[PDB]
Design a protein around this ligand. Structure first.
Ligand SMILES: N[C@@H](Cc1c[nH]c[nH+]1)C(=O)O
Length: 246
């Protein structure tokens, strides 16, 4: 099939992967500007099995579908939540990690439950699966937060600066990000982090629907990495635990 480009990636020994370069701990710009993270390590190890080098392309998370469809990237791999809505537009690998959407509030707010966001200001990442679930499940938060809206941000880092500065009262965000970020910045004990009854997510790798062979190759590589020690090594490095879905 024309859009099944595996043979091209294999012969060029290259594939382009798009990511939000602030999304810790999955794929992010480090203190020296180089990219690191769980997905950086995992994708590198996957494509190593085929002698393929990854070309990492930071993207605007708002534009990820457009960049994939237009061919400027070949995969979305960056804590990319595999949702039903997204399955209408892209194909997914098998999922490799669970995730949950949480609220983050300052401890000084005293807010540890969604109902105490009544009349309070919520923020979200504009292009996130979390924001999509905020709109799709309005009984959870949208109906009760100020203006029945979320302040929208391109990146969670900006949203978190706004939370720190009382510009928003709560932030809807991936738990993996919140846990890593707050620990890295030394401020775990300044914030509450809690689920609010959204259903769990899983992360997977997104491709163009027609790239069916590529998806199989990612899945086959996962099978090797689970038993060769590498998945566990990467998991321990970034999470201090085994996040394998088994
Ligand atoms: N998991 C969320 C948030 C995110 C991942 N990378 C950047 N933002 C999503 O898939 O939209």
């Amino acid at each position: 099939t024309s859009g099944d480009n595996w043979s091209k990636y294999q012969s060029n020994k290259s594939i382009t992967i798009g990511f939000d370069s602030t999304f810790v701990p999955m794929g992010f710009a480090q203190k020296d500007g180089s990219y690191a993270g769980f997905d950086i390590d995992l994708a590198t190890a996957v494509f190593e099995k085929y002698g393929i080098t990854v070309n990492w392309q930071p993207i605007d998370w708002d534009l990820k579908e457009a960049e994939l469809t237009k061919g400027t990237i070949d995969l979305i791999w960056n804590g990319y939540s595999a949702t039903d809505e997204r399955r209408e537009k892209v194909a997914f690998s098998n999922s490799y990690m669970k995730n949950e959407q949480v609220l983050v509030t300052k401890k000084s707010s005293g807010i540890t439950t969604a109902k105490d966001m009544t009349g309070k200001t919520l923020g979200a990442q504009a292009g996130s699966s979390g924001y999509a679930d905020f709109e799709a499940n309005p009984e959870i938060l949208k109906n009760i937060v100020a203006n029945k809206e979320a302040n929208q941000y391109q990146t969670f880092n900006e949203a978190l600066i706004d939370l720190k500065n009382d510009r928003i009262d709560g932030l809807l965000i991936d738990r993996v990000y919140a846990n890593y970020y707050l620990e890295a910045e030394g401020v775990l004990n300044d914030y509450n982090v809690f689920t609010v009854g959204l259903e769990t997510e899983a992360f997977a790798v997104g491709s163009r629907k027609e790239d069916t062979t590529l998806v199989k190759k990612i899945n086959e590589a996962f099978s090797s990495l689970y038993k060769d020690g590498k998945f566990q090594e990467i998991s321990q490095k970034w999470f201090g635990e085994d996040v394998a879905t088994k």
